[PDB]
mmCIF file of C-alpha atoms in Angstrom:
data_model
loop_
_atom_site.group_PDB
_atom_site.id
_atom_site.type_symbol
_atom_site.label_atom_id
_atom_site.label_comp_id
_atom_site.label_asym_id
_atom_site.label_seq_id
_atom_site.Cartn_x
_atom_site.Cartn_y
_atom_site.Cartn_z
ATOM 1 C CA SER X 1 4.540 -72.704 2.913
ATOM 2 C CA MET X 2 3.629 -68.766 1.305
ATOM 3 C CA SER X 3 3.073 -69.058 -2.773
ATOM 4 C CA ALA X 4 4.630 -67.365 -5.119
ATOM 5 C CA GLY X 5 4.055 -66.188 -8.308
ATOM 6 C CA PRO X 6 7.033 -65.856 -11.085
ATOM 7 C CA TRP X 7 10.402 -65.215 -11.362
ATOM 8 C CA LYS X 8 10.799 -61.127 -11.736
ATOM 9 C CA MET X 9 13.201 -58.713 -11.193
ATOM 10 C CA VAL X 10 12.993 -54.995 -11.233
ATOM 11 C CA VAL X 11 16.524 -52.409 -11.738
ATOM 12 C CA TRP X 12 16.471 -48.872 -11.345
ATOM 13 C CA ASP X 13 19.162 -46.385 -12.933
ATOM 14 C CA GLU X 14 19.532 -44.516 -9.353
ATOM 15 C CA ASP X 15 20.938 -46.424 -6.112
ATOM 16 C CA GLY X 16 17.833 -47.314 -3.046
ATOM 17 C CA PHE X 17 15.398 -47.498 -6.387
ATOM 18 C CA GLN X 18 15.023 -44.450 -7.459
ATOM 19 C CA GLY X 19 14.999 -42.979 -10.820
ATOM 20 C CA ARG X 20 13.794 -44.581 -13.943
ATOM 21 C CA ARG X 21 12.384 -48.574 -13.742
ATOM 22 C CA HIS X 22 12.089 -51.364 -15.536
ATOM 23 C CA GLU X 23 10.257 -54.353 -14.354
ATOM 24 C CA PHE X 24 11.665 -58.343 -15.793
ATOM 25 C CA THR X 25 10.068 -61.750 -16.375
ATOM 26 C CA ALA X 26 12.791 -62.740 -18.448
ATOM 27 C CA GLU X 27 15.955 -61.981 -20.290
ATOM 28 C CA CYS X 28 17.180 -58.872 -20.574
ATOM 29 C CA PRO X 29 20.401 -59.131 -23.931
ATOM 30 C CA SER X 30 21.322 -55.067 -23.003
ATOM 31 C CA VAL X 31 19.264 -52.498 -20.694
ATOM 32 C CA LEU X 32 20.186 -49.693 -22.915
ATOM 33 C CA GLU X 33 18.181 -51.423 -25.570
ATOM 34 C CA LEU X 34 15.390 -50.423 -22.697
ATOM 35 C CA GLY X 35 16.774 -46.689 -23.054
ATOM 36 C CA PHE X 36 18.375 -46.664 -19.825
ATOM 37 C CA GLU X 37 22.479 -45.279 -19.329
ATOM 38 C CA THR X 38 23.036 -47.690 -16.508
ATOM 39 C CA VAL X 39 21.701 -50.616 -13.705
ATOM 40 C CA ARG X 40 22.360 -48.846 -10.270
ATOM 41 C CA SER X 41 19.974 -50.671 -7.915
ATOM 42 C CA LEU X 42 17.444 -53.707 -8.874
ATOM 43 C CA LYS X 43 15.600 -55.912 -6.597
ATOM 44 C CA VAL X 44 15.068 -60.103 -7.453
ATOM 45 C CA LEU X 45 11.399 -59.969 -6.622
ATOM 46 C CA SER X 46 11.170 -64.235 -7.072
ATOM 47 C CA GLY X 47 14.042 -66.941 -8.662
ATOM 48 C CA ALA X 48 17.405 -66.442 -9.103
ATOM 49 C CA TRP X 49 19.027 -64.060 -11.519
ATOM 50 C CA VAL X 50 22.174 -63.717 -13.561
ATOM 51 C CA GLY X 51 23.730 -60.455 -14.287
ATOM 52 C CA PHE X 52 26.073 -59.911 -16.387
ATOM 53 C CA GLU X 53 28.901 -56.826 -16.979
ATOM 54 C CA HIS X 54 28.647 -56.317 -20.733
ATOM 55 C CA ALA X 55 25.971 -56.628 -22.648
ATOM 56 C CA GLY X 56 24.918 -60.083 -24.444
ATOM 57 C CA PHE X 57 25.515 -62.045 -21.575
ATOM 58 C CA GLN X 58 29.393 -61.301 -21.035
ATOM 59 C CA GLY X 59 31.701 -60.559 -18.489
ATOM 60 C CA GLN X 60 31.325 -60.688 -15.402
ATOM 61 C CA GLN X 61 29.235 -62.614 -13.602
ATOM 62 C CA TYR X 62 26.880 -61.924 -10.938
ATOM 63 C CA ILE X 63 24.571 -64.598 -8.822
ATOM 64 C CA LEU X 64 21.093 -62.336 -7.670
ATOM 65 C CA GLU X 65 18.996 -64.438 -5.078
ATOM 66 C CA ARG X 66 15.834 -62.767 -3.494
ATOM 67 C CA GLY X 67 16.488 -59.615 -1.215
ATOM 68 C CA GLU X 68 17.326 -55.980 -2.398
ATOM 69 C CA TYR X 69 20.346 -54.435 -3.690
ATOM 70 C CA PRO X 70 20.109 -50.629 -2.974
ATOM 71 C CA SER X 71 24.207 -50.298 -4.740
ATOM 72 C CA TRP X 72 26.132 -52.297 -7.111
ATOM 73 C CA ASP X 73 28.273 -53.297 -3.654
ATOM 74 C CA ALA X 74 25.391 -55.234 -2.259
ATOM 75 C CA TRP X 75 26.244 -57.453 -6.677
ATOM 76 C CA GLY X 76 30.114 -56.758 -6.604
ATOM 77 C CA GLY X 77 31.338 -55.914 -3.515
ATOM 78 C CA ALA X 83 31.379 -54.134 -10.369
ATOM 79 C CA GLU X 84 30.134 -51.554 -11.044
ATOM 80 C CA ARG X 85 28.560 -51.888 -14.093
ATOM 81 C CA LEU X 86 25.532 -54.492 -14.332
ATOM 82 C CA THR X 87 24.466 -54.106 -18.564
ATOM 83 C CA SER X 88 22.657 -57.819 -18.974
ATOM 84 C CA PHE X 89 20.551 -60.235 -16.968
ATOM 85 C CA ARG X 90 18.831 -63.448 -16.999
ATOM 86 C CA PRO X 91 17.450 -65.862 -15.209
ATOM 87 C CA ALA X 92 18.891 -68.559 -13.698
ATOM 88 C CA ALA X 93 16.869 -71.419 -15.152
ATOM 89 C CA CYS X 94 17.872 -74.834 -14.182
ATOM 90 C CA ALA X 95 18.425 -73.499 -9.751
ATOM 91 C CA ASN X 96 16.862 -75.911 -7.484
ATOM 92 C CA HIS X 97 18.466 -76.113 -4.521
ATOM 93 C CA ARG X 98 17.343 -79.021 -2.975
ATOM 94 C CA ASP X 99 17.838 -80.694 -6.969
ATOM 95 C CA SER X 100 21.433 -80.052 -7.316
ATOM 96 C CA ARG X 101 24.225 -82.396 -7.871
ATOM 97 C CA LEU X 102 27.425 -80.723 -9.201
ATOM 98 C CA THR X 103 30.588 -82.895 -10.148
ATOM 99 C CA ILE X 104 33.714 -81.523 -9.925
ATOM 100 C CA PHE X 105 36.806 -82.569 -12.206
ATOM 101 C CA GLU X 106 40.468 -81.670 -11.516
ATOM 102 C CA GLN X 107 41.890 -81.600 -14.657
ATOM 103 C CA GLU X 108 39.721 -80.407 -18.305
ATOM 104 C CA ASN X 109 37.849 -83.468 -20.258
ATOM 105 C CA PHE X 110 35.859 -85.052 -17.186
ATOM 106 C CA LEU X 111 39.607 -86.587 -15.977
ATOM 107 C CA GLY X 112 42.289 -86.380 -12.782
ATOM 108 C CA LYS X 113 40.126 -86.831 -9.188
ATOM 109 C CA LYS X 114 36.291 -86.153 -8.412
ATOM 110 C CA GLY X 115 34.534 -85.177 -5.854
ATOM 111 C CA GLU X 116 30.455 -85.486 -5.607
ATOM 112 C CA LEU X 117 29.157 -82.614 -4.542
ATOM 113 C CA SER X 118 25.207 -81.087 -4.095
ATOM 114 C CA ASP X 119 25.856 -79.331 -0.400
ATOM 115 C CA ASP X 120 27.107 -76.187 0.165
ATOM 116 C CA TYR X 121 30.516 -76.133 0.465
ATOM 117 C CA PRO X 122 32.729 -72.170 1.645
ATOM 118 C CA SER X 123 36.333 -74.207 1.551
ATOM 119 C CA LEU X 124 36.958 -76.734 -0.725
ATOM 120 C CA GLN X 125 39.732 -77.620 1.047
ATOM 121 C CA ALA X 126 37.943 -78.246 4.044
ATOM 122 C CA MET X 127 36.096 -81.332 2.023
ATOM 123 C CA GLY X 128 39.114 -82.589 1.158
ATOM 124 C CA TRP X 129 39.599 -81.197 -2.517
ATOM 125 C CA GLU X 130 43.116 -81.254 -2.728
ATOM 126 C CA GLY X 131 44.598 -77.691 -4.235
ATOM 127 C CA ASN X 132 43.509 -74.684 -5.445
ATOM 128 C CA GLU X 133 41.987 -75.512 -8.922
ATOM 129 C CA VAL X 134 39.464 -77.009 -10.449
ATOM 130 C CA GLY X 135 39.471 -77.912 -14.329
ATOM 131 C CA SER X 136 35.315 -79.432 -15.294
ATOM 132 C CA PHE X 137 32.554 -79.482 -13.811
ATOM 133 C CA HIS X 138 29.490 -81.684 -15.230
ATOM 134 C CA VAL X 139 26.287 -80.259 -13.294
ATOM 135 C CA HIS X 140 23.485 -83.101 -13.724
ATOM 136 C CA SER X 141 21.172 -80.783 -11.391
ATOM 137 C CA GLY X 142 20.330 -77.660 -9.903
ATOM 138 C CA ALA X 143 22.452 -74.545 -10.870
ATOM 139 C CA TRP X 144 26.109 -73.509 -8.754
ATOM 140 C CA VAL X 145 28.040 -70.857 -8.345
ATOM 141 C CA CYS X 146 32.295 -71.149 -8.070
ATOM 142 C CA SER X 147 33.993 -69.179 -6.570
ATOM 143 C CA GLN X 148 37.570 -67.381 -6.753
ATOM 144 C CA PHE X 149 38.190 -67.940 -2.974
ATOM 145 C CA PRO X 150 37.541 -69.433 0.104
ATOM 146 C CA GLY X 151 33.998 -67.939 1.126
ATOM 147 C CA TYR X 152 32.492 -67.587 -1.718
ATOM 148 C CA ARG X 153 34.802 -64.261 -2.926
ATOM 149 C CA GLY X 154 36.621 -63.021 -5.350
ATOM 150 C CA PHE X 155 35.809 -63.423 -8.897
ATOM 151 C CA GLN X 156 32.141 -66.077 -9.507
ATOM 152 C CA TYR X 157 30.871 -67.865 -11.804
ATOM 153 C CA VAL X 158 27.688 -69.911 -12.872
ATOM 154 C CA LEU X 159 26.968 -73.286 -13.893
ATOM 155 C CA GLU X 160 24.063 -74.414 -15.313
ATOM 156 C CA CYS X 161 22.111 -77.686 -15.851
ATOM 157 C CA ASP X 162 21.318 -76.203 -19.153
ATOM 158 C CA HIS X 163 24.701 -75.750 -20.631
ATOM 159 C CA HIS X 164 25.345 -78.389 -23.369
ATOM 160 C CA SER X 165 23.504 -81.098 -20.906
ATOM 161 C CA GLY X 166 25.068 -79.743 -17.956
ATOM 162 C CA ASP X 167 29.050 -80.271 -19.241
ATOM 163 C CA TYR X 168 31.628 -77.824 -19.330
ATOM 164 C CA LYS X 169 34.912 -79.369 -19.960
ATOM 165 C CA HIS X 170 37.139 -76.501 -20.718
ATOM 166 C CA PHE X 171 37.552 -73.406 -18.729
ATOM 167 C CA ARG X 172 36.409 -72.200 -22.021
ATOM 168 C CA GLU X 173 33.199 -73.562 -21.873
ATOM 169 C CA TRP X 174 32.946 -71.089 -18.243
ATOM 170 C CA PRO X 179 41.983 -68.837 -18.047
ATOM 171 C CA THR X 180 41.832 -69.144 -14.532
ATOM 172 C CA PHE X 181 41.343 -71.648 -12.894
ATOM 173 C CA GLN X 182 41.411 -70.842 -9.425
ATOM 174 C CA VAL X 183 38.394 -72.468 -7.056
ATOM 175 C CA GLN X 184 38.027 -72.660 -3.460
ATOM 176 C CA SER X 185 33.909 -72.516 -2.876
ATOM 177 C CA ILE X 186 31.034 -73.990 -4.439
ATOM 178 C CA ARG X 187 27.313 -73.855 -3.565
ATOM 179 C CA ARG X 188 23.988 -73.783 -5.522
ATOM 180 C CA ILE X 189 21.588 -71.238 -6.081
ATOM 181 C CA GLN X 190 17.869 -71.074 -4.165
ATOM 182 C CA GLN X 191 15.531 -69.851 -6.355
ATOM 183 C CA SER E 1 38.220 -88.744 5.920
ATOM 184 C CA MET E 2 42.102 -87.628 6.615
ATOM 185 C CA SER E 3 43.106 -87.273 9.701
ATOM 186 C CA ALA E 4 43.943 -83.387 10.033
ATOM 187 C CA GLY E 5 45.449 -81.057 12.941
ATOM 188 C CA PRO E 6 44.804 -78.489 14.800
ATOM 189 C CA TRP E 7 43.785 -74.615 13.917
ATOM 190 C CA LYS E 8 46.639 -73.039 12.176
ATOM 191 C CA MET E 9 46.499 -70.242 10.098
ATOM 192 C CA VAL E 10 49.792 -68.256 8.585
ATOM 193 C CA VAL E 11 49.938 -64.255 7.770
ATOM 194 C CA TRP E 12 52.568 -63.091 5.981
ATOM 195 C CA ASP E 13 53.239 -58.783 5.057
ATOM 196 C CA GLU E 14 53.400 -59.148 1.854
ATOM 197 C CA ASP E 15 50.795 -59.832 -1.768
ATOM 198 C CA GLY E 16 51.559 -63.837 -2.398
ATOM 199 C CA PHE E 17 52.226 -65.749 0.642
ATOM 200 C CA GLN E 18 56.527 -63.362 0.400
ATOM 201 C CA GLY E 19 58.254 -61.178 2.885
ATOM 202 C CA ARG E 20 57.195 -61.520 6.689
ATOM 203 C CA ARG E 21 55.229 -64.485 7.635
ATOM 204 C CA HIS E 22 53.797 -65.747 11.756
ATOM 205 C CA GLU E 23 51.540 -68.816 12.202
ATOM 206 C CA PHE E 24 49.053 -69.381 14.778
ATOM 207 C CA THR E 25 47.509 -71.445 16.261
ATOM 208 C CA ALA E 26 45.333 -68.987 19.112
ATOM 209 C CA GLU E 27 44.750 -65.540 19.073
ATOM 210 C CA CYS E 28 46.288 -62.397 18.559
ATOM 211 C CA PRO E 29 45.073 -59.543 20.011
ATOM 212 C CA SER E 30 47.100 -56.998 17.247
ATOM 213 C CA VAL E 31 49.860 -58.570 14.917
ATOM 214 C CA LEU E 32 51.582 -55.539 15.159
ATOM 215 C CA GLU E 33 52.517 -57.046 18.413
ATOM 216 C CA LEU E 34 54.499 -59.125 16.668
ATOM 217 C CA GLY E 35 57.157 -56.111 15.353
ATOM 218 C CA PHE E 36 54.497 -56.637 12.381
ATOM 219 C CA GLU E 37 53.088 -53.593 9.959
ATOM 220 C CA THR E 38 50.481 -55.369 7.798
ATOM 221 C CA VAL E 39 49.107 -58.792 6.904
ATOM 222 C CA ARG E 40 48.863 -58.354 3.361
ATOM 223 C CA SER E 41 47.940 -62.375 2.743
ATOM 224 C CA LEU E 42 47.162 -65.293 3.803
ATOM 225 C CA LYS E 43 46.553 -68.798 4.524
ATOM 226 C CA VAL E 44 44.447 -71.278 6.212
ATOM 227 C CA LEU E 45 45.502 -74.367 7.177
ATOM 228 C CA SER E 46 43.039 -76.186 10.075
ATOM 229 C CA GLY E 47 39.886 -74.629 11.274
ATOM 230 C CA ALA E 48 38.378 -71.176 10.869
ATOM 231 C CA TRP E 49 39.280 -68.409 12.203
ATOM 232 C CA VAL E 50 37.692 -64.678 12.070
ATOM 233 C CA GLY E 51 39.773 -61.428 10.778
ATOM 234 C CA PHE E 52 39.658 -58.248 12.352
ATOM 235 C CA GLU E 53 39.986 -55.050 10.763
ATOM 236 C CA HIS E 54 41.777 -52.640 13.711
ATOM 237 C CA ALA E 55 43.283 -54.373 16.412
ATOM 238 C CA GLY E 56 41.931 -56.056 19.389
ATOM 239 C CA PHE E 57 38.790 -57.413 17.879
ATOM 240 C CA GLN E 58 37.214 -54.625 16.823
ATOM 241 C CA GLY E 59 36.121 -53.548 13.443
ATOM 242 C CA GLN E 60 34.956 -54.784 10.030
ATOM 243 C CA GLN E 61 35.556 -58.891 10.932
ATOM 244 C CA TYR E 62 36.024 -61.122 8.025
ATOM 245 C CA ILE E 63 35.634 -65.164 8.173
ATOM 246 C CA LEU E 64 38.496 -67.108 6.791
ATOM 247 C CA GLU E 65 37.589 -70.789 6.081
ATOM 248 C CA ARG E 66 40.630 -73.423 4.952
ATOM 249 C CA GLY E 67 42.592 -72.532 1.574
ATOM 250 C CA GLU E 68 44.587 -69.151 1.152
ATOM 251 C CA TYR E 69 44.042 -65.789 0.775
ATOM 252 C CA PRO E 70 46.980 -63.306 -1.658
ATOM 253 C CA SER E 71 45.592 -60.445 -0.861
ATOM 254 C CA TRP E 72 43.123 -58.519 0.523
ATOM 255 C CA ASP E 73 40.214 -59.165 -1.800
ATOM 256 C CA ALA E 74 40.286 -62.805 -0.850
ATOM 257 C CA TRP E 75 39.262 -61.728 2.124
ATOM 258 C CA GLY E 76 37.307 -58.233 2.259
ATOM 259 C CA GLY E 77 36.430 -58.290 -1.578
ATOM 260 C CA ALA E 83 39.155 -53.959 3.645
ATOM 261 C CA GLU E 84 42.803 -53.754 2.920
ATOM 262 C CA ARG E 85 43.247 -53.689 6.766
ATOM 263 C CA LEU E 86 43.061 -56.804 8.868
ATOM 264 C CA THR E 87 45.207 -56.205 12.479
ATOM 265 C CA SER E 88 43.599 -59.110 14.430
ATOM 266 C CA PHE E 89 42.295 -62.620 14.628
ATOM 267 C CA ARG E 90 40.822 -65.494 16.880
ATOM 268 C CA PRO E 91 39.707 -69.229 16.027
ATOM 269 C CA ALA E 92 35.422 -69.449 15.630
ATOM 270 C CA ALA E 93 36.098 -71.875 18.792
ATOM 271 C CA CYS E 94 32.582 -72.868 18.136
ATOM 272 C CA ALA E 95 32.393 -73.798 14.556
ATOM 273 C CA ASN E 96 30.973 -77.021 13.885
ATOM 274 C CA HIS E 97 29.544 -77.470 10.604
ATOM 275 C CA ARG E 98 26.857 -80.216 11.256
ATOM 276 C CA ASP E 99 26.007 -79.332 15.027
ATOM 277 C CA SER E 100 24.956 -75.682 14.590
ATOM 278 C CA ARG E 101 21.638 -73.946 15.060
ATOM 279 C CA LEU E 102 20.417 -70.539 15.008
ATOM 280 C CA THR E 103 17.048 -68.802 16.067
ATOM 281 C CA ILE E 104 16.667 -65.311 14.841
ATOM 282 C CA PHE E 105 13.871 -62.925 15.791
ATOM 283 C CA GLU E 106 12.633 -59.972 14.402
ATOM 284 C CA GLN E 107 13.162 -57.296 17.059
ATOM 285 C CA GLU E 108 15.795 -56.874 20.093
ATOM 286 C CA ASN E 109 15.354 -59.491 22.965
ATOM 287 C CA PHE E 110 13.951 -62.788 21.260
ATOM 288 C CA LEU E 111 10.957 -60.583 20.374
ATOM 289 C CA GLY E 112 8.929 -60.355 17.050
ATOM 290 C CA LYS E 113 8.657 -63.335 14.223
ATOM 291 C CA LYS E 114 11.205 -66.045 15.207
ATOM 292 C CA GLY E 115 13.093 -68.195 12.161
ATOM 293 C CA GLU E 116 15.206 -71.620 12.536
ATOM 294 C CA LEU E 117 17.921 -71.832 11.727
ATOM 295 C CA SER E 118 19.830 -75.261 10.676
ATOM 296 C CA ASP E 119 20.872 -74.792 7.193
ATOM 297 C CA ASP E 120 23.229 -72.056 4.880
ATOM 298 C CA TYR E 121 20.686 -69.435 3.337
ATOM 299 C CA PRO E 122 21.726 -66.983 0.504
ATOM 300 C CA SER E 123 18.325 -65.494 0.515
ATOM 301 C CA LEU E 124 16.262 -65.007 4.078
ATOM 302 C CA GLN E 125 13.730 -63.795 1.958
ATOM 303 C CA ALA E 126 13.707 -66.547 -0.251
ATOM 304 C CA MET E 127 13.051 -68.868 3.050
ATOM 305 C CA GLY E 128 9.546 -66.733 4.098
ATOM 306 C CA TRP E 129 11.356 -64.114 6.326
ATOM 307 C CA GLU E 130 10.279 -61.088 6.358
ATOM 308 C CA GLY E 131 11.615 -57.940 5.460
ATOM 309 C CA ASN E 132 15.392 -56.774 5.452
ATOM 310 C CA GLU E 133 15.878 -56.804 8.794
ATOM 311 C CA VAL E 134 16.182 -58.690 11.827
ATOM 312 C CA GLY E 135 17.024 -58.188 15.311
ATOM 313 C CA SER E 136 18.190 -60.703 17.620
ATOM 314 C CA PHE E 137 19.690 -64.420 18.261
ATOM 315 C CA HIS E 138 20.247 -66.936 19.714
ATOM 316 C CA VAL E 139 22.859 -69.040 18.218
ATOM 317 C CA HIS E 140 22.224 -72.743 20.075
ATOM 318 C CA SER E 141 25.230 -74.177 18.803
ATOM 319 C CA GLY E 142 27.865 -73.258 16.064
ATOM 320 C CA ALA E 143 28.967 -70.608 14.552
ATOM 321 C CA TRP E 144 27.049 -68.160 11.893
ATOM 322 C CA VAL E 145 28.091 -64.880 9.372
ATOM 323 C CA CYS E 146 25.864 -63.455 8.213
ATOM 324 C CA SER E 147 25.760 -60.661 5.550
ATOM 325 C CA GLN E 148 24.013 -57.254 4.600
ATOM 326 C CA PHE E 149 22.648 -58.226 1.430
ATOM 327 C CA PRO E 150 21.722 -61.604 -1.029
ATOM 328 C CA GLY E 151 24.420 -64.054 -1.079
ATOM 329 C CA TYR E 152 26.468 -63.035 1.546
ATOM 330 C CA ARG E 153 28.165 -59.903 0.326
ATOM 331 C CA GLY E 154 28.542 -56.392 2.170
ATOM 332 C CA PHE E 155 28.936 -56.145 6.140
ATOM 333 C CA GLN E 156 29.592 -59.764 7.820
ATOM 334 C CA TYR E 157 28.964 -60.789 11.273
ATOM 335 C CA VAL E 158 29.757 -63.627 13.376
ATOM 336 C CA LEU E 159 28.393 -64.882 16.190
ATOM 337 C CA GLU E 160 28.817 -67.692 18.589
ATOM 338 C CA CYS E 161 27.381 -70.070 20.839
ATOM 339 C CA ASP E 162 29.809 -69.248 23.538
ATOM 340 C CA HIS E 163 28.836 -65.725 23.487
ATOM 341 C CA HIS E 164 26.411 -65.051 26.486
ATOM 342 C CA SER E 165 25.390 -68.299 26.301
ATOM 343 C CA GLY E 166 25.186 -67.628 22.429
ATOM 344 C CA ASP E 167 22.320 -65.025 23.287
ATOM 345 C CA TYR E 168 22.504 -61.846 20.962
ATOM 346 C CA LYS E 169 19.785 -59.704 22.185
ATOM 347 C CA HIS E 170 20.986 -56.206 21.020
ATOM 348 C CA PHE E 171 22.790 -54.743 17.888
ATOM 349 C CA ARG E 172 25.129 -53.631 20.663
ATOM 350 C CA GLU E 173 26.302 -57.058 21.153
ATOM 351 C CA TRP E 174 26.962 -57.505 17.597
ATOM 352 C CA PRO E 179 23.049 -50.409 14.665
ATOM 353 C CA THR E 180 22.116 -51.650 10.871
ATOM 354 C CA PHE E 181 19.580 -53.906 11.270
ATOM 355 C CA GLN E 182 19.919 -54.688 7.933
ATOM 356 C CA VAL E 183 20.216 -59.036 6.881
ATOM 357 C CA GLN E 184 20.303 -60.671 3.827
ATOM 358 C CA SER E 185 21.707 -63.593 3.842
ATOM 359 C CA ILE E 186 23.649 -65.763 6.778
ATOM 360 C CA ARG E 187 25.395 -69.611 6.426
ATOM 361 C CA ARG E 188 27.121 -72.263 9.117
ATOM 362 C CA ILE E 189 31.026 -71.454 9.799
ATOM 363 C CA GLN E 190 33.125 -74.168 8.250
ATOM 364 C CA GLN E 191 36.270 -75.266 10.242
#
């Protein structure tokens, strides 16, 4: 129970925390706006952050929890990371998500308050999810079991947690889902 | 609370569950011994399994929980998977692991009975772990936060759960650890 400071991450433009450095305490819509050409390594010092492939928070999403990322494989196993924002709703102990088989909160539902490396192991029918309501916390969904493939992040403060369409988050393949750790 | 059958996985030698097929209900030390040339897709129907890069359960390890894996990116985001074994100790609700900063159960310790996408968020000092005692369950450790980078699996029935050396599991980098879901 050490006492942490405000959420913070640091980016560098060369691998292994070398080269040009910049620290963030709030979102950055494009590192190019700093004069950086690229982000090649990073550290998350406090909190949880979402990295995005393209400027303006567009493209592939990467969840960035506390720790050290010496090259791009550390966040995307994906070489390009251009914008960043805090996962503002992250609250690991206060996370609750409802998933639905179809869009618009229709079809069979599942209630999640824990992490699921295998939706199918838990009883979910099929490999698709159609809509989501985030009651609290921030969640990350993955295409494949064990938190692999394309990720996407769901926040409690997006349309009051409503994601009625895959347009709001078109492949509907989701096989693992977990809570984000701030 | 549907009733599941015995642990089972199925492999195919082409992507998308096409081509030659073979089902396992026990370990396979080499798919080449079946006459297969390669495994390109797979499904885990029941239980949790460990895939290995090389024959004889050697090389990179991949955790395979229930679901569908249409190509190699589904298990390794790593194209080669040659041998497979059940994660026999997997027991998600009955998993407990002790981690140590140094080898031989020395140094600071941490007690884990939950999943940790960020060891550093939980209070662990540094990015290294030196030894492990698995009290119960099966666990998977990852190099980077959020369950990325090289994985390795720790079982309760390996030397009574003792892993005193990195030789038993030399890079000591571990930033996330979770329980395997059978």
